[PDB]
């Protein structure tokens, strides 16, 4: 169900004291719906975020194993924000059965404040997607 064959294109770069994040698209996804395709929406949050007001989501794609979102946001928080973790979840919206989770990713904010994390990324599991950072070349 969680297949680490899919790759998600995430970019987080700090410019003018604003964290300009970008979610371009993903490729090599697995069939998650009865349609034989996937229809995921990306949620970008700065954890811990229990009230999920930092968590911003994009809209779902029709039906494609290569969903393209092309969203970009700008969220900076007071200096304590560097201690947070930028966790991005990939959930498929299903009214038929259940939301299909294939994977997620996370970036260290202290890392992003010193260097912009921009490129492809591998699908991490739920435990990993809140902690680890593993950027993938894919090019
Ligand atoms: Ca599904
Ligand atoms: Ca779906």
| Distance in Å, CA 56 to ligand 2 centroid | 19
| Distance in Å, CA 47 to ligand 2 centroid | 26
Joined tokens for residue 48: 């811990």
- CA–CA separation, 21 and 86 (whole Å): 10
Scan for tokens 């809209």, then name that residue: 59
Q: Are 10 and 124 in contact (CB under 8 A)?
A: no
Instruction: Report the structure determination method.
Output: NMR
Nearest to 105 by CA among 39, 31, 17, 45: 45
- DSSP class per residue in 54-76: S-EEPPPPSS-SS-EEEEEEE--
Is residue 113 helix, strand or coil?
Answer: helix
Is residue 110 helix, strand or coil?
Answer: helix
| Residue set of the binding site for Ca(2+) | 32-33, 39, 92-94, 98, 100
By the 10 Å C-beta count (0-12 exposed, 13-18 middle, 19+ buried), 64 is classed as: middle
- CA–CA separation, 25 and 31 (whole Å): 16
- The answer for residues whose C-beta is within 8 angstroms of residue 109's C-beta and 6 or more apart is 19, 46, 81, 82, 83, 84, 85, 86
| Distance in Å, CA 125 to ligand 2 centroid | 19
Is residue 9 helix, strand or coil?
Answer: strand
Joined tokens for residue 77: 């928080």
Q: Where are the beta strands (DSSP E) in the chain?
A: 7-14, 19-27, 40-47, 56-57, 68-74, 85-92, 100-108, 117-122, 135-136
| Distance in Å, CA 104 to ligand 2 centroid | 16
DSSP 111: H
CATH architecture assigned to 1-139: Sandwich (2.60)
């Amino acid at each position: 169900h969680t297949e680490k064959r899919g790759r998600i294109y995430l970019k987080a770069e700090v410019t003018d004291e604003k964290l300009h994040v970008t979610v371009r698209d993903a490729k090599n996804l697995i069939p998650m719906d009865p349609n034989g395709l996937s229809d995921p929406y990306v949620k970008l949050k700065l954890i811990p975020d229990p009230k999920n007001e930092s968590k911003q989501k994009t809209k779902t794609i029709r039906s494609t194993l290569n969903p393209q979102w092309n969203e970009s946001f700008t969220f900076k928080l007071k200096p304590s924000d560097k201690d947070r973790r930028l966790s991005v979840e990939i959930w498929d919206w299903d009214r038929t059965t259940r939301n299909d989770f294939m994977g997620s990713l996370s970036f260290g904010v202290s890392e992003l404040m010193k260097m912009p994390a921009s490129g492809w990324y591998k699908l991490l599991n739920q435990e990993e997607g809140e902690y680890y950072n593993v950027p993938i070349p894919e090019g």
